[PDB]
Amino acid sequence: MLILAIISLITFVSMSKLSDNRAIIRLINIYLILVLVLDSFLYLLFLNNQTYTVMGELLIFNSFTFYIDMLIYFIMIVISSLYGYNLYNNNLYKTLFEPKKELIILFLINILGALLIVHSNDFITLFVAIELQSYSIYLITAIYNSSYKASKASMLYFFMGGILSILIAYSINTYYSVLNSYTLHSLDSLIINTLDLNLILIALSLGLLFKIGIAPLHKWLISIYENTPILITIYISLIPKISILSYLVLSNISINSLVISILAILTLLVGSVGGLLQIKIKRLLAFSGLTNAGYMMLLLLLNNNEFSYLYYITQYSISHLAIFMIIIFSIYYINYINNQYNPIIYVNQLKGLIHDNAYLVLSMAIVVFSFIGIPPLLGFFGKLNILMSILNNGYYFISIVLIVASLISALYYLYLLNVSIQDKNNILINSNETVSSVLSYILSSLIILITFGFIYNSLIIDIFNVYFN
């Protein structure tokens, strides 16, 4: 369905005028929804954890990959709604949020690259998919080329991602030079015992992991996140992280790695502490993303990680979308617009948001407490599953460091809510324009999922037991 949409969109957009942009996005939006609800039944193929090799063993399809594909579709639906629908109908919002002509095509191609990374069974598939996603993401970072910061960010992305792509390619070719193979399927317990692949496989892991920005190579990506337009930042800080992490979770090439243990510890410490002095909202959220990446990095040290990874990545994606949507919604109530690409920059600009929109601040409180991990919000159960996994496997010191990082990052999570519930002197009385019905419903659905999803926990585990065992 995705390839078809890309071909049709290139043709249609070529024959369309710049004023049709939003309409076109709306079309693709509904198309994606339809694919999600009419093609869902294919989950049945994976009953009892049946695995299928496809395309002459280039691709692998199982229940894990099918779930990740559904999640990526859902994320694309949510993010494309933010371009297809106006928050308000006034002139300022036309200036703030207008989709570029080719942006939707770049999004769909990037999604294709991500889904191909997830399903990669051979290293040539992995490299082609990785370069597809990387090139698309550079172009997505650059497409708002009136912005000085965005163009500079795109250059930085191109060069750092190119160096890391080279590291990945070199890893794959060393693996080939040792084994005369391009597939991890040729690895057996006997082969792992017989040969030292650790340096090759960790080089591959690090090449992949630095591309989503773990420590100590975190600042460049955080800079890119700060300096992109906000509706671009929502997309580019989530999709690559999901695709790369899902591939590493499914590949299991770093089990009980000392190097990955040390880098995960460093990532948790850097992400928690380095978020403390941040005053810009996007930098704060980027450090939050770094800390949650460290949480998920811990699951690369053990087998049977699928339930805890899938739970964590799902609830994290939901929370990330919710917090960015809340920040976008709050733009209407701020006094000072910093620029047209990042209308809101500083956390302090949210001061007194409760007096302008109380239920927006309730949504913020729910999301922030989920990030902290208060039960019965989804974030608590994500962290609980991760702790169960790591303590079952003997990672005691890392569990203590996880607790400490959670406590530390709670401070900068609470910063948002703290300023948001203080008093402001001039508060809103009335306004004739209402924010869009569609986007408000989407945000509310995300909030409700975060709040009440725990009710389905045991049902979810029951289904998981029959599709993943």
Binding site: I124, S146, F158, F159, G162, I163, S177
Partner: protein, 89 residues
Amino acid sequence: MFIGTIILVLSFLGFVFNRRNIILAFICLETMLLGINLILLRNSVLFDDISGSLFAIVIIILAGVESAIGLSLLVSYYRLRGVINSYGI
């Protein structure tokens, strides 16, 4: 494999310790890819195996597309500033 390895290492060092211009960074990227392909092709010959050569062909095509996109990004960056600084990024 010596020539590929030396080319890759020296190109990487040139990229990292580049403090002169941005074109050197572009060139060092291209030549690191060349070194990787050389290593791969020698192993392909020594195994008499087509998989290495297939990957090398794909690497060449992807290097072409990456060059095109990188230079498009550079031109878009130039459009707003009219010049590239010796820190131009």
